[PDB]
């Protein structure tokens, strides 16, 4: 009975309260297998649309970073009521690439009972940090959310990519969890590697007024992962028109030059009848970059003027940092908009200054946090959170994936939290 988030807000709490009014629930997409441990789950992908979901993960054996990749799972399924008015993910279609080490940065979109996942094939490693030697290859997988008993190519299909339109950018790659559909058009979040020498930037355009420790070129050398990097990363969308022809063009739409930061994991989601774009803050500006989409093509995003939600960085770029300094660091903590009247959004954000830890589900306004709830302990390390809100039996429910590496586990996996936006504000 899970549907998309539409209509007016009815029977919730949208005022600031200090009481523990939020009750998260530990849901899971599958039952854990007994007597199994010693593997680490990395690069998670959770995308939600019209009661359907997709998940993707790289399960490795041993070290979380450079162990042996046990499997890569890209699976779609239905989001159903689990029995006690709580939504849990139910996987139906599962696919495993034959080379899990070459698949990076998948990006998942629903359109008409299929789920299109666009990933990057790379025999050179991660296409962000050694992008100069990257081929530029991508892959599109069609997974049926309803798999028939004998469908063949309907259940799992590999759509061949032949026509790539990218313009001035040297290469493009899908760089985010979830995109949108507009009729028959898929808009994945993506990034474009431009060369640094042709990057047109006015060095007097970026704001350096309030901070006395910032040279006014730092806004341009912070646009890549290194100050001397060959490529800059410009975020945006990748457009796939499914009625374009036999081989559709995959067209890169660059983001608007307003509030320009580095290309980071972004996500465009259709909330309350309109697209909302969230670009992660992997740069000097650590306040949350998300806002309304004025035009999908070309990508113009009316960013929120948010002052209370930020991200935990590292040294030299902490939380709540606003001065332009050279840094490529940060975490993906997305926010899903649940009320367009006051622009109230809900998402899991980490609540430490220099450390990626303490995941808190926060429902917040533009310049005020309404109410928060701790998902784990204060010193529990969390890395990347993906929140998607929806309507189950006319109740607003937000399913959140958190990269919780809590102490005492013999197996490492993201935790799935179903958090109802509470009916009564007391």
């Amino acid at each position: 009975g899970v549907s998309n988030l539409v209509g007016l807000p009815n029977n919730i709490c949208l005022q600031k309260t200090s009481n523990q009014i939020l009750k998260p629930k530990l849901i899971s997409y599958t039952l854990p297998v007994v007597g199994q441990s010693g593997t680490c789950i990395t690069d998670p992908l959770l995308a939600m649309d019209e009661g359907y979901f997709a998940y993707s993960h790289l399960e490795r054996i041993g070290s979380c970073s450079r162990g042996v990749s046990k499997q890569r799972i890209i699976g779609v399924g239905e989001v159903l009521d689990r029995g006690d008015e709580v939504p849990s993910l139910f996987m139906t279609n599962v696919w495993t690439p034959p080379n899990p080490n070459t698949v990076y940065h998948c990006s998942a979109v629903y359109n008409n009972e299929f789920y299109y996942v666009l990933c990057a094939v790379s025999t050179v490693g991660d296409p962000i940090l050694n992008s100069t030697y990257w081929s530029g290859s991508l892959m599109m997988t069609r997974l049926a959310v309803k798999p028939k008993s004998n469908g063949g190519g309907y259940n799992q299909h590999q759509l061949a990519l032949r026509s790539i339109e990218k313009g001035r950018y040297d290469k493009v790659m899908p760089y985010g969890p979830s995109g949108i559909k507009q009729g028959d058009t898929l808009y994945f979040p993506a990034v474009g590697f431009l060369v640094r020498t042709e990057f047109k930037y006015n060095d007097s355009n970026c704001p350096i007024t309030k901070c006395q420790y910032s040279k006014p070129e730092n806004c341009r050398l912070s646009m890549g992962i290194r100050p001397n990097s060959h490529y800059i990363l410009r975020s945006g969308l990748l457009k796939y028109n499914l009625s374009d022809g036999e081989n559709p063009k995959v067209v890169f739409i660059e983001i608007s030059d307003q509030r320009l930061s580095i290309g980071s994991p972004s996500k465009i989601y259709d909330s309350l009848g309109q697209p909302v774009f969230y670009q992660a803050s992997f740069s000097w500006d650590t306040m949350i970059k998300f806002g309304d989409v004025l035009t999908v093509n070309p990508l113009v995003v009316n960013w929120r003027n948010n002052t209370v939600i930020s991200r935990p960085g590292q040294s030299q770029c902490p939380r709540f940092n606003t001065c332009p300094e050279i840094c490529w660091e940060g975490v993906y903590n997305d926010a899903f908009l649940i009320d367009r009247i006051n622009w109230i959004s809900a998402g899991v954000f980490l609540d430490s200054n220099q450390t990626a830890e303490n995941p808190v589900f926060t429902v917040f306004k533009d310049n005020e946090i309404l109410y928060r709830a701790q998902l784990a302990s204060e010193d529990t390390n969390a890395q990347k959170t993906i929140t998607n809100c929806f309507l189950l039996k006319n109740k607003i429910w937000c399913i959140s994936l958190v990269e919780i590496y809590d102490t005492g586990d013999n197996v490492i996996r993201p935790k799935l939290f179903a958090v109802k936006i509470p009916e009564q504000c007391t």
Partner: antibody, heavy 118, light 108 residues
Framework: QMQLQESGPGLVKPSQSLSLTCTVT?????????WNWIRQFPRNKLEWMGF???????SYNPSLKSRISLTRDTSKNQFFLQLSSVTTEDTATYYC????????????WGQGTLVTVS | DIQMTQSPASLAVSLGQRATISCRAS??????????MHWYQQKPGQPPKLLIY???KLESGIPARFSGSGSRTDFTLTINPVEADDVATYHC?????????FGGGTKL
């Protein structure tokens, strides 16, 4: 019981194709676990070169990644190892094994076939 | 690539005495409280047999005299007592990082 049994040519030409086959009896390959190909040098130095999982995913040794290819056969319930440009040092006793319950240990091993490059 | 060195390479033990083998890992194989160290026994003319998995747990059917211990860099394998069935080669294998490099050999 899963008696893994290896086969293939025990004498290959240098700078050629090294094809080896492992058949699993008593168990289904495309059900669970991972199937490893592990070589042992004549100095009793064992080396892991890769596995193929039940779903078809293959993980390889990074130092052999350009040459090694592991494939499967669901209908015959077998799995094959392919090594391109075999050289003189590649003479070894090859075993096919099942990864254990947690996939990082090799529970049962095949009898192994000695491959000599001469 | 963790380089693995187990000592001594030439170990001879009398019957009914404790046998000790110490394996050195060049890096750390304990990441989230899990010890990715395994001990294998290979009789001559036979494939290796898994003795100890995760450096402290005994395989099914394997006698309990084979005891694995140690952590982090340094691991140990103890035989108490030995009999006329331990004439084999003992390998310490890491599984924390790629590739899953084995150890050398113990001639005992």
């Amino acid at each position: 019981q899963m008696q893994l049994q290896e086969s293939g040519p025990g004498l290959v030409k240098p700078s050629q194709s090294l094809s080896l086959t492992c058949t699993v009896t008593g168990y289904s390959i495309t059900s669970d676990y991972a199937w490893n190909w592990i070589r042992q040098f004549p100095r009793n130095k064992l080396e892991w070169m890769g596995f193929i999982t039940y779903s078809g995913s293959t993980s390889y040794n990074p130092s052999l990644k350009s040459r090694i290819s592991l494939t499967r056969d669901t209908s015959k319930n077998q799995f094959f190892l392919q090594l391109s440009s075999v050289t003189t040092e590649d003479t070894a006793t090859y075993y096919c094994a099942r990864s254990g319950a947690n996939w990082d240990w090799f529970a049962y091993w095949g009898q192994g076939t000695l491959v000599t490059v001469s | 690539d963790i380089q693995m060195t187990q000592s001594p390479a030439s170990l001879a033990v009398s019957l009914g005495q404790r046998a000790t083998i110490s394996c050195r890992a060049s890096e750390s194989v304990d990441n989230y409280g899990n010890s990715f160290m395994h001990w294998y026994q290979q009789k001559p003319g036979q494939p290796p047999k898994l003795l100890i998995y995760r450096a402290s747990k005994l395989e099914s059917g394997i006698p309990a005299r084979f005891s694995g211990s140690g952590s982090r860099t340094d691991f140990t394998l103890t035989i108490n007592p030995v009999e006329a069935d331990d004439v084999a080669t003992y390998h310490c294998q890491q599984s924390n990082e790629d590739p899953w490099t084995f150890g050398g050999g113990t001639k005992l």
